[PDB]
Paper text:
Cyt1Aa, Cry11Aa, and co-crystallized Cry4Aa and Cry4Ba. Solubilized protoxins are activated by insect gut proteases enabling binding to gut cell membranes, subsequent oligomerization, and ultimately gut cell lysis leading to larval death.
The dissolution profile of F17Y crystals is again characterized by a reduced slope, as compared to WT crystals, explaining that the plateau is nonetheless reached at the same pH (~pH 11.6). We note that F17, D180 and the H-bond between them are strictly conserved in Cry11Ba; hence, the importance of interface 2 for crystal formation and dissolution could be extendable to crystals formed by Cry11Ba. To evaluate the significance of these changes, we characterized the distribution in size of crystals of Cry11Aa-WT, Y449F, F17Y and E583Q using AFM. The structures of the other three mutants were determined, using the WT structure as a molecular replacement model for the phasing of diffraction data.
Residue numbers in the entry:
A (entry chain A): 323 to 429
B (entry chain A): 216 to 643
C (entry chain A): 14 to 643
The structure:
Amino acid sequence: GNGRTNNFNFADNNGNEIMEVRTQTFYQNPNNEPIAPRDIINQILTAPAPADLFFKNADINVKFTQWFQSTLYGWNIKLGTQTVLSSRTGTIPPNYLAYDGYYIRAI
Amino acid sequence: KDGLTFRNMCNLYVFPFAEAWSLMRYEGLKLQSSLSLWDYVGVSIPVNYNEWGGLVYKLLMGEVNQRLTTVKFNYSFTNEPADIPARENIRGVHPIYDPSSGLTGWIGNGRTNNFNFADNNGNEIMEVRTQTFYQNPNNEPIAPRDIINQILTAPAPADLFFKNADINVKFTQWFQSTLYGWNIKLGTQTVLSSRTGTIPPNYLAYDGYYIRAISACPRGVSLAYNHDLTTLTYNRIEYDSPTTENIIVGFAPDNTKDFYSKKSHYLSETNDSYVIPALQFAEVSDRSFLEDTPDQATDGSIKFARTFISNEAKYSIRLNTGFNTATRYKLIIRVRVPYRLPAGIRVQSQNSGNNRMLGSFTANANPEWVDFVTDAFTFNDLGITTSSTNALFSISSDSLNSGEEWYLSQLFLVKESAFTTQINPLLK
Amino acid sequence: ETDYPLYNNYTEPTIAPALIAVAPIAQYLATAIGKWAAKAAFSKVLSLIFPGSQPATMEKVRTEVETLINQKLSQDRVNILNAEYRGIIEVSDVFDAYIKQPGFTPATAKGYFLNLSGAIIQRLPQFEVQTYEGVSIALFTQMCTLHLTLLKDGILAGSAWGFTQADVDSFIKLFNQKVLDYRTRLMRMYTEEFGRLCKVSLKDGLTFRNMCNLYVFPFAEAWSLMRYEGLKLQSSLSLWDYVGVSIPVNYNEWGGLVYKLLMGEVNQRLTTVKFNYSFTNEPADIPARENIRGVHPIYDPSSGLTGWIGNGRTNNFNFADNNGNEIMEVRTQTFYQNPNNEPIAPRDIINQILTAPAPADLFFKNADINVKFTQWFQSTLYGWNIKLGTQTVLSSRTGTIPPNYLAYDGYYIRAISACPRGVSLAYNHDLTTLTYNRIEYDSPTTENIIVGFAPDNTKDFYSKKSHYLSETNDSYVIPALQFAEVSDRSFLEDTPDQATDGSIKFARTFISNEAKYSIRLNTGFNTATRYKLIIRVRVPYRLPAGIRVQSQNSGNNRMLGSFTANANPEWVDFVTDAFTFNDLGITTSSTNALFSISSDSLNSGEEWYLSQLFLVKESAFTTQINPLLK
């Protein structure tokens, strides 16, 4: 798909490669008091193979939502016993990907 | 900064005596100075003398008859390069006096991002923080980089005014490039502690003075524009510049503390002489400019150059309890009239429609300063008592022509008994 | 869709404002306000409203109103209204026929007069059904005009029509009651329909207000001048053309922000207008599109009050107004390269600031602004065409767009503004004043242009900045908004019933509240003639200092009047004592003469309203119906 995380062209340079970019925005309303900081995160999740070379199962799922004729998404990613991504948009039901007598070879 | 230092010296050692010279021919007037002392903290910026009297001083004063109610700073911090140490920038200053007027604007830059989402969706933007993370295979420590752009806000204290400040700036060199660090504290409110390390304090205080204005100077931009537009009212008092990197604090003597608190000149029976500076007015006409006349021992004078309707300036007067209204008084007006005015100058007393004419003076061409003395009057003839809250003294003149102007400096109110001219000015 | 030319958003040209069906009624109303003909004005009003005892003119009025406001009436409602018309016509014919007989019996005339008044009162409410109010508010108006006229004449011809003194007093009381009740009900209908249509869309509310400015409000103002004799009946309302998309506007938002943005500097001439234009066709599938991002009307070049109505930004480099010269246009051209194909389609992205200064004759007389819509996968694309006068400001790059002629015979373009789109309009209400505070509102786009046309009777003020007086004329009317200078914390209040573009609301709690007007005298003006001033004010809260009218002339300040201000929610007229221009020290060479209406400072939450000034000779002025006898 797309491995880019920003528009500064500073992806893989200066020795260490970029991993995560988090922008937090704060507002101020005179008539109100609660402050809702807005988060914008763009990161690269990494998952190496287990000690036994192969993953045996996975728990990957996606949740849909509608909002004024526009579909919003939420993701849940887990390979083996390593939780790769828990959904920030609320709990998502698990989707067990497994076949007795099979192992994960490609993703 | 050096010019401000020299002017601060002259305000204490030179100009008060120059003003005292102009009052030796009379007897009974009050010798009072209202000049301000200006502290400058930041980098060096060259300023022409045409640019000082046409823009810089107007930006330093702002609303010349209003109390400072809020001050906002545009703060920027960044350490994205791993080799360059952390740095801080002051991008703009916004002093807010009258909350319902909207005259003073940003002196530097009020922008925080390039999304154009500054003041929208009800709540205005306040802070933007970007945190960047890296990953090195050969190393293990991770140094997250921070980029912060925020708007610091400081309202006036409970006692309306700040008495002192602790603002300082620290310089650093790095491959022929200067990095900065800032420390800002107004009164007891810590506005900004430096993230680039500890910075020694710089106490800004003068015994007998209080903080009246906080402004800045534009850096990196031409200061030769909007001279004829920067007036005392109507037009927006602002100037766009990417950064300022400087903060200027004005201290005013305590003899002006009552005006910026009560918005009116209160009169006591015990005192004999009263001096009213021109800039301490209730309202002023359009197309009026602030002229730097430091020799008058005041923060300036009013230059009228409006070629329509009229040129008028009003001052609010209030009487304390125990004031005798049967005592005779006189008014002295200090004006400079380079061009002849066929209608002359007029001093009028307005009180809830009880408008009385105090004086009409023939205005002839004269490049020097002139004093006009009115006839004797009593406060019973003006219909003013201890309960009057809309009494006004109005100095007015007709409309001018193109290229013409006339200057008003100060007003002197003194009892008839204690006033006497000793040296005649007409015998030249 | 339609590619035919348009005429002020209508498919066929509209009737001139002086050629509408209610024009002779208004002309004779003004003539009678100038000098009322006793026991004869009602017959003329009846002949003008019902010519030949026929309701054909009222049907023409109904058809014209239905054409303007895009609202038609059912046939049953038409039959009911015509039946009411004939019912009134019968009694009116009886009365008018019995009057003209030389030597009639006055008691019989009294009986017929009472019958006619009662019949009009009885049949009035048929035009007050709110479900059709937007169409009937015009018709209703004329009917009230037929009644308030009647009573008026009845008060003048007392014993001639068999009226005792108690009869005349009762008629005066009924007149003083009805002249308020009718105005209240008419304003109810107007405000209801206007708020509803504005909650629908701003364009429809503007259309309804344009209709009411020609068919409703002038007569409502004429009602408030029938008790006097010698004043001038003059309307200064503006006609507003709206071109663009639909934007809902609340009634709290109209009177607190939108109208203030439409007027701008209410006493200044338009000198320049700037538009923020955006064009782009970067996607190869989506056709070209154009956007109006903001409008900036500049009146007084040395003031700096009016700001951008939409968005004046052109890029995200923050390099807008810097390095001496300001940015004007940014054009990005992108090129591609396909191996399987050969044609190359360069993509253009333009963001510029179009500038249009006022013509040599200070004002634009007409405009040709139009917008074209397009659909594409449930997304609306726009194209714009802008032309002010003879200067082509913007020709559409997205294809030809049919012209939309914006013109009114007897009107000229005075203001050009816009409405913010996509943002809340509930902020900066208490800050948007007539002066000092910046008249602006930030919004990413507007996608709308609003042009205001003002009648030619105001063309002299916006050119000479002063009110010139002639010896030949008898009465002069000065609107409040045509001032020389105004105090702080003053607001623009929409009072369309005054036949003016608004009134001044004073709410300053310090110093004073003052408004000055500049007066100049033409050669041949008699300074020995006696005059009087009439001030129209609304004072909801008591003012212990009262209102004061003063004459200031180069320091020769004289007091013309001091009036006690008591709490009154209705409109009040204050008349000064007689004076001559020699007592004011004003001649044909005076260029700094000023009339000042002033009051002391107010308290929190208080305000008072000033509407208009009337200057009339003492000989030609006389109050006929007493207002205090309520």
